[PDB]
Every structure is written in C-alpha cells, then in structure tokens.
Amino acid sequence: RGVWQLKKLVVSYCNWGGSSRGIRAFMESELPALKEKNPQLEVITELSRGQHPYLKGINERVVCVKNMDPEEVLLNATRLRNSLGRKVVKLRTRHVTKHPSVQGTWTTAV
Amino acid sequence: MNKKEIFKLAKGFRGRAKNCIRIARERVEKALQYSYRDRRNKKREMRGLWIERINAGSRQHGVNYGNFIHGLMKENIQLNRKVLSELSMHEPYSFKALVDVSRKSF
Amino acid sequence: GGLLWKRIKLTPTRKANAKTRLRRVWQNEAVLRACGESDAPNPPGASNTKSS
Amino acid sequence: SLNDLRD
Amino acid sequence: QSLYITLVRGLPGTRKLHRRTLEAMGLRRCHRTVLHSNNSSIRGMIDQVKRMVVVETEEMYNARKEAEANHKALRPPLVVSH
Amino acid sequence: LKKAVAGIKRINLDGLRWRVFDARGQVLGRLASQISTVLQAKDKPTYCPNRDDGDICIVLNAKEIGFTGRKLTDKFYRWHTGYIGHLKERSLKDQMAKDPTEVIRKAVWRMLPSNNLRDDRDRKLRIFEGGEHPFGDKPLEPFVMPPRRVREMRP
Amino acid sequence: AEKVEEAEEIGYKVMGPLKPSERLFKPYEPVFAIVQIGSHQFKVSNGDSIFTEKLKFCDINDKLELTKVLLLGSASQTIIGRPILPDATVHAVVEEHALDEKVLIFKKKRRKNYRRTRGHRQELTKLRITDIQGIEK
RNA sequence: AGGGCUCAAGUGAUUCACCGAAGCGACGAGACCUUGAAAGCUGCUUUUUCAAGUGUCAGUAGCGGAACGUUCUGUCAAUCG
C-alpha cells in the first residue's frame, strides 16, 4: 500500500507565558528540518494565545506538550509523522490475511 | 482520577460492581490481575494448542509427535512450532512431504 | 496425620531424572579425578549436552 | 525578575 | 587443563555455604558458564558443589561447541514438489 | 425401533463425517480412549478447542466384547439415589446381561473432558450391540485402530 | 553506518531503496514462503501484512529484503530450505512505523500494603509483504 | 482422582524421543550501577550524550531518592472569556 497517510498537522501553542517555552523553542529549532524531510505533510503551524500548548494531526489526534521540552517534542512530532489515522485498539492478530493458503484448507480430502 | 478511570474499565461487570465505587474497585482489582496471569499464560496456553494440530495431522501420516520433531531437529529444519502448526492447518501436501522427510531419519 | 503430606512414589519416569543426575555427577567427578595434575586427559565432548 | 528564582 | 564450570539446576534452595561458594567463584545465575585455571584451589573449592552443578567441564568443551556449529550450520536445500 | 434407535442426528451438524468403530470383542479401555479421541475431534488437524467437530463414530457388537482379568464379577457400578441410606449397586455381569451398550457409553462419558460440551458430544455417538445398523446409506467409513498392538504374552 | 548494515542483516533484513512509484501490490497470490524475523516467524503470501518489532534501521516507504527464508511452497512444490538462504528473496515494504496500545500491569499481594501501578507501550512496523521468488507458480 | 488398566496402562534392570515454569535464552522496551569514548565541567576533575555490559532490576515492616495532583498567594492594572 503506497501512500502517505498523515495528511495534515498542527502545532497549537502560545507566545506569552512560561508554559509554552518548550514548544516555542521547538518551533524555530526543528520545524524546518522535519519539514524539508517531509514535503508530503501539511504542517500548518498556527497559534492560539494564552492556551496551554498541544499538537494535532490526522479524524483527530491530539497530543499535549505542556511543560515539555524540544529534544522530546521533536520525537513527539516524528511519532505523529510516522503514524496512521488509527485509533489505539489493542492488536487482534499479528498477521492479517484474506488468502491463507495455496493448497486447499484441510477437509476430508488428502 | 482513578475514581473515574475505574469506571472506564468497569464496562460489562454485573451487579452493583459497575455503578458504585467501593465495589467497583474490587471486581476491577481482580480484573487486572487476571490479565497479568494471562499475559503470562497465553504464551503457554497456546503452546500446547499448537502441538495437538501437528500431532493429529501427522499421526494421520503415521509419524507421532515425538518421532516427527526428533527427525526434524536432527536433520536441521529449524522451522518452529507456530508455522509448523499453520502448515498442518492449511497445507496438506507440503506438510505431508515434511512428515516423509522426518520419517527419513527413524 | 492431620495435614496430609502425600508420599510421592519413586516411579520409572523419575528414575529417569535420578539416573540423569547420576551420569551427570559421574562425568563431573570423572573429569575432576582426571585433573590430579594440570593436564587435559578427558576425551573431547563427553555428552553433557544430551543432558535433558 | 520575579518568576525565575530558585535555590 | 583449564576447567570450565557452568551452573545448572538452580540456586534458590541450597545450603548457605554452597550459595556463598558458588557466588565466590562467580557463577551467579543459572545457565551461566565461567572459566578458571584449576590449580587445586578451584578443583577442591568447587568440588563442594558438584551436587549443585552437574557439569564442571574441562578444556575439551570447545569440541562440544564445535559440534554445535556443525549441527546449526547450513546445508543444501531440499525440493519435493509432490 | 428404527425411530427410537436412529437417535437425534436430526440435531447435530451432519456434514462432516461418519466413521465406524467395531470392537472385534477385545478390550474396553483400548476401545475407549480411541473413541474419546475420535469422538472429540482431536485427531484431525483443524482442531480448535471451543467447539464440537466430533465426527460420528459408531461402535458395533458390544455383545462380542472382551474385558480381561476377572473384574467382570468384581467391579460394580455404584450410584446414589439421594434418598438417605441408599446406594444402588450393580455388578458388571448384571450390567452386561442387561445392556452391554450402557457400559461403554458410560465409560467414554467419564473419559471425555469434564466440560459442558460432553453431553453435546455424546449427542454425536450411537450404538448397536449387533453388526446390524440402519446408518448404512450414509457415507460410511469403517475405522482401523492404531497399528500399535504388540500384545505381550504370558505362561 | 555499516554497523547498522550488519546489524540489520543479522536481524535478517536489509534496507534497499525508497519508492516513488512502481505499481507493485499485484493480486497474484498463489505462493507461500515461511519468513522469519528475530525469533518471530510468519508464513506469508503476496500482499499480506505482518506486524513486527521495531525493525530498527528502516523507516517509511522502504523496501526490505529479509534474507531469511525457511521454506517455499507452491501448489505441491516444496523448495524445502534449511534455514540459511538459497538465494530466495522476499521484497517487502514498510508503512505505519508507529505505536500499538497501552497495557496495564498492576501487581498486588493479597493482604500486603503493596499496590504498585504502572504503564507500558510498544511501537511496531506493519510490513506490507509484496514479493517472493524461488518458486514454480 | 476417576475413567478404567493382566491383551499392563504393574513391578526390577537397560535405551531413545517428547512435553514441560514468569528459569535461561531471541528480538525489543525502560530504570539504576558499571565500562569506556567524547564533551563540558574549573575541579582540571565533577557532570551529561553516546555506546558496551551469559551487569543488575521478587518484597512486609522499615528506610533513602524522585514525581503527580488540589485550595490559596507573589509572578498579574498580565493573559484568556
């Protein structure tokens, strides 16, 4: 299955207040590197005054980054970048299949 | 807090074990230990589950489980139990060839 | 007689493990009693690995 | 500077 | 001669002396193998725990491993095609 | 009575297999364990333990049957009727002159695994102490016991 | 990064190129090969998925060539390999190199004031298996 | 324990396999400690990155380290509504 899947991302953050220092540093620090690596993303990096900071992606996947730090916020962006649109549902079976065989499945015949 | 993230797991319980707390905490404080016993228990529960198949679908071809595995380990087929069971399940002809190869020891 | 400590009977498939540890310590003291000097007189690879 | 002080 | 010893059968239930003696040489967990020059301080010292560890292998253990590699090494493929 | 002996095969799934165990008159337990397998579907590869795919296995001629030693007149069957005091007991000679089917039916019942599919397995088992059976027109596979009978002999 | 190379190959894989567009993912599905990764086997045909365990040195939209192969089987044709590779190739590809789920361990001793709580996650790589060779078909 | 076992599925002796545990391994994840390497430290030697550890990592009482939250109050004639 060849396609990109994270079809859009947001980094909502603040500009006044000590909470969003980590995400602000993240902004100038490692946005451009990841972005130049990933053109397929629509990384629209808007703001939201006075509110505790978070990230969002494709559905809706939200990740708070309050009182966090850039070295980790980079990973917490690359998570979302690798991710699907999945909801977290504990694995059913490790190898999904619609065709399990070439020989016929076992019946009264050998 | 925990006071509601219990009432998140509690879905499905019977009695007042789903609404009230002083009872929810109990059927749930077990409802985790059982899951510990089975994330240590399924890995083995399934183990025996596998052999039974191979056992049956080879005893169909004469070789008994012990002879089968003996022959295969000795002539170096490091295929392992899960996929041996899946071929037992889904591949009568290749599995039959396997049984013959392991009869090519004893 | 109050608390029932059962008596496991020594059975052929336990005799199995008996003779197992027997042949094991046999090799063990065998190579030790060989080492009555700093020599290497013990035939290579006495089983030690079929121990199972 | 009144929200930075530590020990 | 260079004997190579290797713990087996476990250490949870044992006389304290053997645990300390086993520990003194260096075996500290099951299925571990250490190597010493015998010198009659080790042959004796670890003779107190021959019951505990079935094997106190000599310098010909390499041969056992040599055989293992051959057993585990690759050989030409088999084709059936019924 | 064709009706009263043809059983409830109108209840199971039919579409898997019909197989015939005819004890040649040899031995209870060595007939039995073989049954408790075949009549538990653990003998074919596609086993899965939350279901009944037990094949139809049909035993024949329980009159001609052999039980060694002299248990026949020694091992009774015991059963308790609830009413205080009582313990209704019946030797195997009695049981065999009564109905030599019940014997093996009860035996395999006890051997089968102790779960609530046990009755729902015996719902896939039928018996005639003859060779005469009306379950012939159906696809009939007579069965052979394992080739594992050395039969040690004594003076 | 040749330590990375060797490490992947002793994990039985090797990361080839990226992929702009080649039109793989055909429906031809008549062959099965028994491929092993790092103490975790899987029987496979063309197009299946397989979850994995942090296939370490790869990333989005990569074609791995897992050098391990245990047995190739067509209709009744059994190139019955002995674990090492007789030149068979298993070309596969990564998507969704991301986490799985929260799983709760919580241990308690029936009457001891000891109620340790915890948390845990695991990240995995859904290999969409694509190609296989060494067969009759 | 029962089914039921002499047509051993019993006993005494010899031989192979197999199964089998949260053991030990295989990948993989963390925490601390060790080992380096490299920094920075001003101390010129404590303090963070990495990487290597068949290093370690059951626990009451009890003890040491780190963390979450809550009400208030400075940061705030600030900021959101």
UniProtKB/Swiss-Prot annotation, chain G:
One of its GO terms (molecular function) is rRNA binding. GO terms for biological process: double fertilization forming a zygote and endosperm; embryo sac development; karyogamy; polar nucleus fusion; pollen development; translation. Constitutively expressed in roots, stems, leaves, flowers, pistils and siliques. Keywords: Developmental protein, Fertilization, Karyogamy, Mitochondrion, Ribonucleoprotein, Ribosomal protein, RNA-binding, rRNA-binding, Transit peptide. Disulfide bonds: none annotated. The keyword Transit peptide applies. The keyword Zinc-finger does not apply. GO terms for cellular component: mitochondrion; plasma membrane; ribonucleoprotein complex; ribosome. Disruption phenotype: Failure of fusion of the polar nuclei during megagametogenesis and abnormal double fertilization; fails to undergo fusion of the outer nuclear membranes. It is found in: Mitochondrion. Its main location: mitochondrion. This protein binds to 23S ribosomal RNA in the presence of protein L20. Required for karyogamy during female gametophyte development, when the two polar nuclei fuse to form the diploid central cell nucleus, and during double fertilization of the egg cell and the central cell. Component of the mitochondrial ribosome large subunit. Belongs to the bacterial ribosomal protein bL21 family. This is Large ribosomal subunit protein bL21m. It comes from Arabidopsis thaliana. The gene is RPL21M. The chain holds residues 110 to 246 of 270 of the full protein.
